[PDB]
Amino acid sequence: FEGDLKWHHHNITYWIQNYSEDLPRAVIDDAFARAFALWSAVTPLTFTRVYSRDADIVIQFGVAEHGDGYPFDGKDGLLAHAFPPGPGIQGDAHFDDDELWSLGKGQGYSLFLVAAHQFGHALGLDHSSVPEALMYPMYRFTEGPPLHKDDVNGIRHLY
Numbered sequence: 416f417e418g419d420l421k422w423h424h425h426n427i428t429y430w431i432q433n434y435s436e437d438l439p440r441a442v443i444d445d446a447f448a449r450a451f452a453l454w455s456a457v458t459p460l461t462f463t464r465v466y467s468r469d470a471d472i473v474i475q476f477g478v479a480e481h482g483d484g485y486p487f488d489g490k491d492g493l494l495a496h497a498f499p500p501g502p503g504i505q506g507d508a509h510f511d512d513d514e515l516w517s518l519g520k521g522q523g524y525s526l527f528l529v530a531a532h533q534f535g536h537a538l539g540l541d542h543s544s545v546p547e548a549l550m551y552p553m554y555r556f557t558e559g560p561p562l563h564k565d566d567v568n569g570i571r572h573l574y
């Protein structure tokens with residue numbers, strides 16, 4: 416799921432197609448909004464929620480096979496995936512609803528942190544080799560600003 420294209424515009428739009436049964440819709444909406452805010456905080460990018468399939472980043476929760484040729488694997492393992500910039504499915508973010516979605520310390524996975532990571536992918540970032548960076552391919556909950564200098568350097572290099 417690695418690509419070589421970046422968005423040719425900075426006013427990015429996203430559409431929350433559906434939701435997970437683990438969290439209230441208001442909490443989900445807010446987690447996604449806060450995740451995007453992390454990236455717009457260090458770049459000239461903006462993220463506007465829309466209600467149309469024409470959004471750049473379409474967000475959906477799915478289980479096992481869900482359309483694209485990359486079905487989820489149930490509890491744990493693959494948590495989600497996002498397609499790099501481009502038209503159509505490109506740029507979209509899919510979350511495995513077989514996971515226990517939560518926030519903060521505790522069991523389950525933070526939808527906030529995972530979304531922030533997935534949106535990094537949706538923006539064209541690849542994985543980071545820095546263990547403490549958000550783009551590091553390993554889920555670990557920790558307090559503190561999600562973006563590491565490496566993440567900031569990486570996203571600014573693109574936008």
Ligand SMILES: O=C1NC(=O)C(c2ccc(Oc3ccccc3)cc2)(N2CCN(c3ncccn3)CC2)C(=O)N1
Pocket residue numbers: 491492493494495496497528529532533536548549550551552553554555556
């Ligand atoms: O697009 C991706 N990219 C990933 O690296 C992914 C994942 C998604 C989001 C993550 O959030 C995160 C990243 C850094 C710090 C805190 C939280 C961490 C890991 N990991 C999850 C763990 N996954 C893995 N798990 C078990 C066996 C093999 N691989 C590798 C991919 C993922 O689910 N989707």
Ligand SMILES: [Ca+2]
Pocket residue numbers: 455456457458459460
């Ligand atoms: Ca900004």
Ligand SMILES: [Ca+2]
Pocket residue numbers: 470471472473501502503504505506507
């Ligand atoms: Ca798209």
Ligand SMILES: [Ca+2]
Pocket residue numbers: 487488489490491492493494511513514
């Ligand atoms: Ca899974």
Ligand SMILES: [Ca+2]
Pocket residue numbers: 435436437511512513514515516
């Ligand atoms: Ca779930």
Ligand SMILES: [Ca+2]
Pocket residue numbers: 517518519520521522523524525
């Ligand atoms: Ca949790």
Ligand SMILES: [Cl-]
Pocket residue numbers: 432433434435
């Ligand atoms: Cl729904």
Ligand SMILES: [Cl-]
Pocket residue numbers: 449
């Ligand atoms: Cl926040």
Ligand SMILES: [Cl-]
Pocket residue numbers: 518519520525526527528
């Ligand atoms: Cl959190």
Ligand SMILES: [Zn+2]
Pocket residue numbers: 481483485496509
């Ligand atoms: Zn998918």
Ligand SMILES: [Zn+2]
Pocket residue numbers: 532536542550552
């Ligand atoms: Zn990743």
